[PDB]
Design a protein around this nucleic acid. Sequence first.
DNA 1: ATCGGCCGCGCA
DNA 2: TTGCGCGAAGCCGA
Length: 452
Amino acid sequence: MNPKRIRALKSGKQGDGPVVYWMSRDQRAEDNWALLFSRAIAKEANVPVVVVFCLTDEFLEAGIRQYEFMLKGLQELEVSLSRKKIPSFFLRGDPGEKISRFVKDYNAGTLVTDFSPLRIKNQWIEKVISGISIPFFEVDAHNVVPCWEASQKHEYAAHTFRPKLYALLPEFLEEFPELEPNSVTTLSDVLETGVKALLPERALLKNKDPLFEPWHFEPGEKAAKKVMESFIADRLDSYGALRNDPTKNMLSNLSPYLHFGQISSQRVVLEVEKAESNPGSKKAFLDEILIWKEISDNFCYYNPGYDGFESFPSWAKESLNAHRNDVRSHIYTLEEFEAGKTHDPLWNASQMELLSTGKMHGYMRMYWAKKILEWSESPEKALEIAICLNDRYELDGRDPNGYAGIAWSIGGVHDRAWGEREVTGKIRYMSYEGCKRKFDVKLYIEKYSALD
DNA sequence: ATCGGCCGCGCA
DNA sequence: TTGCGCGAAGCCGA
Ligand SMILES: Cc1cc2c(cc1C)N(C[C@H](O)[C@H](O)[C@H](O)COP(=O)(O)OP(=O)(O)OC[C@H]1O[C@@H](n3cnc4c(N)ncnc43)[C@H](O)[C@@H]1O)c1[nH]c(=O)[nH]c(=O)c1N2
């Protein structure tokens, strides 16, 4: 392995027990530097390796959609892990408390976890550390270049980062060694329970039939690769030319998978790098899964207040501040955005996409978020509403990409200043009639007339 | 260090 | 739609 992928959280004396992978971000058996390094740590100690996963009360914040998607992936995983002689454990409760006392009851010798920049994982690590005595290691198994090596600071923009990332690629774009099995050694309750809790929340139509359409993305690792293979076969060729067209389905659709870690962007890059297509579409594509995915981890990592206004740049703040007192053309409540009840049938279209399919088109996520700012009573409330709805309804929600992209949208983060307007100040602008020139908006709107 | 280099709209 | 030069605007980094 490349040792720069490991960062020791806590130094201690190794016990003669198992090596415990605390799986959290990367829910896949294959192409997992964290599970691979736990195996290795467990090989040269003549100890087994085990995976432990903590199911927290964070599901009641979102929807059945994300909760099945994650719990069906887990159920596949369990078989995969088990076929490698790796037992996998499922703790119901609070990582800080639960993993600690688990490390206790099993006499773990070493503790490993994947990397994730979201505030709450630092809280749980920091509590975990304060209650164990064995080494605690962290591995970046989500980014091609570990987040702390691509950049030490907050990168102001894509092209300040892009050079630093691309110097390090020859060294970190490597092949994955295969998970060598162990030599020595209840999820269906958890599903049916958690579903009965979420059920009063489900998004129904005027009739009981649920809004959510689950047949657009199957969960799991096996699914995730048939999406990557199909992309490379079918859509990668035209990606750079038709990605901004919400009517052609040319996106890679891999983002529900990556969020849950059911597939490795490192594998995707390896596979794309070796595919033969339009160079500009590889170039377009690598830049999203390479520069924009990982600058998003950098954003949350180096700015703990990423889900708030303060993390904007001083020009964006100063600008939005001066237009706090402007007269909003319209003002809608959260409930009114949430139900696609604005004057903008194109905007209600996109929210209709988000509502029923669980994934809004990459281009329309920009428009949808800017109009939220334009038609709310304050930037803070606009952030508050874009965050809530992105996370409540998007299958890829609750993700660094999420905050890094609402922050681009509402706040200039990783962007520049444009001509000054009412309400929006100097934040980039998007218009109905700018979409008219780029794609058949009449056709998007027709797709989604599920407003009942 | 000094300066290039990151949507909307007219027009053909 | 389909591409281009132009516009408004701030700041990094070489
Ligand atoms: C308002 C708003 C809200 C969100 C987001 C953007 C905006 C403007 N994003 C980011 C982006 O819009 C999203 O990754 C794509 O819609 C994912 O669809 P595909 O995987 O099909 O992208 P596509 O195949 O075109 O891109 C490939 C990959 O590049 C990365 N990427 C693309 N666009 C990016 C962006 N703008 N920022 C960061 N990484 C990017 C992702 O890893 C994506 O899987 C996001 N993404 C996400 O997964 N979860 C979320 O909750 C949000 N939230």
